[PDB]
Design a protein around this ligand. Structure first.
Ligand SMILES: *[C@@H]1O[C@H](CO)[C@@H](O[C@@H]2O[C@H](CO)[C@@H](O[C@@H]3O[C@H](CO)[C@@H](O)[C@H](O)[C@@H]3O)[C@H](O)[C@H]2NC(C)=O)[C@H](O)[C@H]1NC(C)=O
Ligand SMILES: N=C(Cc1ccccc1)N[C@@H]1O[C@H](CO[C@@H]2OC[C@@H](O)[C@H](O)[C@H]2O)[C@@H](O)[C@H](O)[C@H]1O
Ligand SMILES: N=C(Cc1ccccc1)N[C@@H]1O[C@H](CO[C@@H]2OC[C@@H](O)[C@H](O)[C@H]2O)[C@@H](O)[C@H](O)[C@H]1O
Ligand SMILES: *[C@@H]1O[C@H](CO)[C@@H](O)[C@H](O)[C@H]1NC(C)=O
Length: 475
């Protein structure tokens, strides 16, 4: 039966997590507030059922038993993130290191390694300390770069003797678009015409924030390369997300619109990372709302990754949107494109428990080949791939997830094809290890290969998908 021998020797199979979504202990162990503590508490209308990550999976206390589950499944690796405000409660290094926070991550890492599981560490997975958001508006300010750099350094110093795979940040697209265009994610900023956020500007701030995200990423990578990489002997990268874009029709209009959508979502980050400049379509359509890289900045950002982390979930069809005399000025409308999961009333693939998300495993290969061909054959890890179930059945029924078995069977076959096509994929991580706090969707969506019974003591039960992976891994 389909198993890991179909993949390169030493290929890393793992599961993924993030700190705010899993940890809980949000006000414990010396931890300071982050923007997600603030967002979920002050805007309960923006979270399904007014949920928070106050407790989440309580991974902070339950990590020892959870690591046993990872070993049971037989995973090679585990992707997890560092809570910035847990290790630096005041955000700045000068504000002091929280010894209790450092100890937790050390404990998790030491346990993982005893089970032969490699920790892949995301330094920043959106949970910015409130102190930094308060001081200078977080990623709206160039001040964020030095503080991000110091945070990265703390991680390298404290964990780098054991951690050999670093991811600077998770999905700066989501942080910028979600936090500053649509106002759906912390810090919850958007234009007043949306009547959805207290402050913001969806037409300017996402571009400001993305620039500082890239610069912060680049600062961390430069420091790692110059100061830690030679003796710790690890690798550092960044995780990007994009939908795969398919033109709605055969028209030139829809063809160009599809590429514009990809330019604005993916190219926004991977062209600076590869070429030191933003995509031409963005420069043309966004004009002077799009920051320029100085010569120093372009030099720092270009080539600043050892590997690319890619998160893949879905493909969408893309329609051209003609220019209009009625403008809502926003990153969203700047690309003159419209995404839809339906063509001629027919869904792009099998449904999931997430209304927008349909199964399109071919898109994983297409994205990987596109990336190989456009950006000089980079080393790639699939740092997230998964699907969600609606949280509307009993624990008993939730555990039986043949649809997720199917999902991973199909996507791993597609990944196999990408590797055969010469894409240098070295690893693959399931989102998620556990059912968790899924940001604006709260606990209404279950992405785990392991079920968490939120109603009954947060108990863990491996799903059929976990058992499928256990067999796939010959473990
Ligand atoms: C729990 O929530 C899920 C939501 O994902 C429910 O499953 C979904 O049910 C809808 C409506 O029954 C399905 O859509 C329909 O499918 C039929 C036949 O395939 C189609 O002809 C209709 O036009 C309509 O599109 C949807 O596919 C399905 N989603 C899945 C399975 O992922 C489920 O009913 C809920 N369960 C309980 C116990 O409330
Ligand atoms: N600020 C809190 C309350 C809190 C904490 C986590 C999540 C939500 C709400 N607690 C205090 O955070 C402090 C650090 O975080 C600072 O709290 C004061 C804020 O003005 C400042 O911006 C923040 O960095 C810790 O040093 C203290 O031990 C602790 O009592
Ligand atoms: N989900 C994203 C991208 C995103 C998230 C929110 C809004 C716009 C775009 N990326 C990855 O998807 C994973 C699943 O994301 C879910 O996708 C379905 C949404 O309805 C749900 O709210 C979201 O958490 C997240 O848990 C990871 O933390 C994240 O890295
Ligand atoms: C794993 O797959 C290979 C095909 O490459 C097959 O020869 C082998 O028997 C399989 N093993 C199991 C345990 O399924």
């Amino acid at each position: 039966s389909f198993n890991r021998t179909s993949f390169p020797d030493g290929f890393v199979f793992g599961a993924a997590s993030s700190a705010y979504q899993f940890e809980g202990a949000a006000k414990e162990g010396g931890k300071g507030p982050n923007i997600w503590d603030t967002f979920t508490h002050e805007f309960p209308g923006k979270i399904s059922n007014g949920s928070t990550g106050d407790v989440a999976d309580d991974f902070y206390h339950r990590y020892k038993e959870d690591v046993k589950v990872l070993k049971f499944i037989g995973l090679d690796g585990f992707r997890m993130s560092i809570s910035w405000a847990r290790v630096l409660p005041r955000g700045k290094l000068s504000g002091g290191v929280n010894k209790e926070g450092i100890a937790f991550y050390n404990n998790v890492i030491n346990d993982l390694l005893s089970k032969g599981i490699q920790p892949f560490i995301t330094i920043f997975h959106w949970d910015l300390p409130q102190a930094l958001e308060d001081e200078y508006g977080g990623f709206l300010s160039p001040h964020i770069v030095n503080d991000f750099r110091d945070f990265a350094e703390l991680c390298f110093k404290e964990f780098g003797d054991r951690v050999k795979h670093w991811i600077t940040m998770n999905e700066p697209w989501s942080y910028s678009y979600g936090g500053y265009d649509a106002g759906l994610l912390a810090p919850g900023r958007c234009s007043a015409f949306m009547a959805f956020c207290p402050k913001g500007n969806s037409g300017t701030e996402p571009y400001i924030v993305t620039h500082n995200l890239l610069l912060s990423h680049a600062a961390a990578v430069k420091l790692y390369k110059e100061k830690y990489q030679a003796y710790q002997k690890g690798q550092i990268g960044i995780t990007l997300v994009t939908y795969w874009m398919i033109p709605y029709s055969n028209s030139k209009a829809d063809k160009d619109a599809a590429q514009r959508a990809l330019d604005f979502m993916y190219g926004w980050f991977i062209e600076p990372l590869s070429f030191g400049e933003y995509p031409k379509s963005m420069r043309r359509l966004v004009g002077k709302r799009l920051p320029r890289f100085t010569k120093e900045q372009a030099m720092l950002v270009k080539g600043s990754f050892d590997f690319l982390g890619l998160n893949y979930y879905i493909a969408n069809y893309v329609l051209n949107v003609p220019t209009s005399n009625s403008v809502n000025l926003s990153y969203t409308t700047d690309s003159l494109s419209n995404q839809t999961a339906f063509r001629n009333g027919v869904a792009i693939g099998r449904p999931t428990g997430v209304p927008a998300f349909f199964m399109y495993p071919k898109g994983l290969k297409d994205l990987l080949v596109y990336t190989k061909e456009k950006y000089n054959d980079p080393v790639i890890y699939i740092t997230e791939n998964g699907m969600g179930d609606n949280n509307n059945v009993t624990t008993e029924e939730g555990i039986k997830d043949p649809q997720r078995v199917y999902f991973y069977n199909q996507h791993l076959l597609s990944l196999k094809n990408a590797i055969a096509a010469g894409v240098k994929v070295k690893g693959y991580f399931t989102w998620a290890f556990l059912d968790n706090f899924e940001w604006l969707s709260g606990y209404t969506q279950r992405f785990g290969i392991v079920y968490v019974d939120f109603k009954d003591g947060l108990k863990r039960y491996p799903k059929h998908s976990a058992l499928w992976f256990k067999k796939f891994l010959l473990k």
